[PDB]
Write a protein that binds this ligand. Structure first.
Ligand code: 2F8
Ligand code: CA
Length: 122
């Protein structure tokens, strides 16, 4: 699968659901990061674009209470790269996952209605 960053204007950021709909409209989905190689591919997209210091929606979304986090594309949640202390469901409203687009490439759970950049896979 091919990944593509979407870090548009400051008023072009999207909720998790709007970002998923955008990627699905292209025939793909929000990106799942399934291993270190896919993580490095995305990091290199960030360096190539110069889109540093940005947060991006990934396909991480909470399933049932039993399952916890899932990938929107159905991939197994095997590889994980949560930031230390995450996921923390801060204030009980954080059911989607974002990438901090810095060298750590770490994940954080946040409120799905937050406006973020996003990464598609196609
Ligand atoms: C203060 O909360 C923020 O930072 C913590 C980690 O310190 C994060 O866990 C938390 O998700 C994040 N919330 C938002 C809206 O970005
Ligand atoms: Ca969090």
């Amino acid at each position: 699968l091919c990944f593509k960053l979407y870090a548009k204007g400051k008023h072009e950021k999207k909720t998790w659901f709007e970002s998923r709909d955008f990627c699905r409209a292209l025939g793909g989905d929000l990106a799942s990061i399934n291993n270190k190689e896919e993580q490095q591919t995305i990091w290199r997209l960030i360096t190539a674009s110069g889109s540093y210091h940005k947060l991006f929606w990934l396909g991480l979304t909470y399933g049932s209470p039993s399952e916890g986090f899932t990938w929107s594309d159905g991939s197994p949640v095997s590889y994980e790269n949560w930031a230390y202390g995450e996921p923390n469901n801060y204030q009980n409203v954080e059911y989607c996952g974002e990438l901090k687009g810095d060298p750590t490439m770490s994940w954080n759970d946040i409120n799905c209605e937050h406006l973020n950049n996003w990464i598609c896979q196609i």
